[PDB]
Design a protein around this ligand. Structure first.
Ligand SMILES: [Ca+2]
Length: 240
């Protein structure tokens, strides 16, 4: 997250860190959202590589003992069947991870609430992106979980020529684009939390930013629209 602030440790208890094994250690690669005690929602592109993955819930600082973490292996990966890694613009950037164990819920570890199917946010709706992604274009991962206020940019504006044009689909949510705040590499897969009727829900799964840079004016961060995938999510969980 470029232009973020450090999240309070109990603000976003559904955020997870998706990590891969690298040598004798683990490296953060993506975010995700805990949606069942044994299921995480993330981006398909986060699991393109044939890596050993684990999830950390209750994570705040990637580099220090928080005293709240639960570390759990990924047991099964279900990528959306229409995902194509060389066509992120097509959409379908979503995957579910079944965890090896069911995590224990507490103020640091909660299920993310998803929107009702079909819900589309009005332009300029209030949301926060969260994650440990780079803090500057071509920078480094955050140590502490970051949040940034990224209002939505509706489909009509986001798909206009000076924004994303044809690259954005109605199955996506755009947010931000102010040239200051954005997602960045390592935020992928994590939530866009939007406040509606007094409650935050996870309306987005972070999918992509401009190839030119993270915080580029009129290139809002682009998310998979969770509310387009409610049936898909429910079907996967019911069949697994
Ligand atoms: Ca930690």
């Amino acid at each position: 997250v470029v232009g973020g602030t450090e999240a309070q440790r109990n603000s976003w208890p559904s955020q997870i860190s998706l990590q891969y094994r690298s040598g004798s250690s683990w490296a953060h690669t993506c975010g995700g959202t805990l949606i069942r005690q044994n299921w995480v929602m993330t981006a398909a592109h986060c699991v393109d590589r044939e890596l050993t993955f684990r999830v950390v819930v209750g994570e705040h600082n990637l580099n220090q003992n928080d005293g709240t973490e639960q570390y759990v292996g990924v047991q099964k990966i279900v990528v959306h069947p229409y995902w194509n890694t060389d066509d992120v613009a097509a959409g379908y950037d979503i995957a579910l991870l079944r965890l090896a164990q069911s995590v224990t819920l507490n103020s640091y570890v909660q299920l993310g609430v998803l929107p009702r199917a079909g819900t589309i946010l009005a332009n300029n709706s209030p949301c926060y992106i969260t994650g440990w992604g780079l803090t500057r274009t071509n920078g480094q991962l955050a140590q502490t979980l970051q949040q940034a206020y990224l209002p939505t940019v509706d489909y009509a504006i986001c798909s206009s020529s000076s924004y994303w044009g044809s690259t954005v689909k109605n199955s996506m949510v755009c947010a931000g684009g102010d040239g200051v705040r954005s997602g960045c590499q390592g935020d992928s897969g994590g939530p866009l939390h939007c406040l509606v009727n007094g409650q935050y829900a996870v309306h987005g799964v972070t999918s992509f930013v401009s190839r030119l840079g993270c915080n580029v004016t009129r290139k809002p961060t682009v998310f998979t629209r969770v509310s387009a995938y409610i049936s898909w999510i429910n079907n996967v969980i019911a069949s697994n």
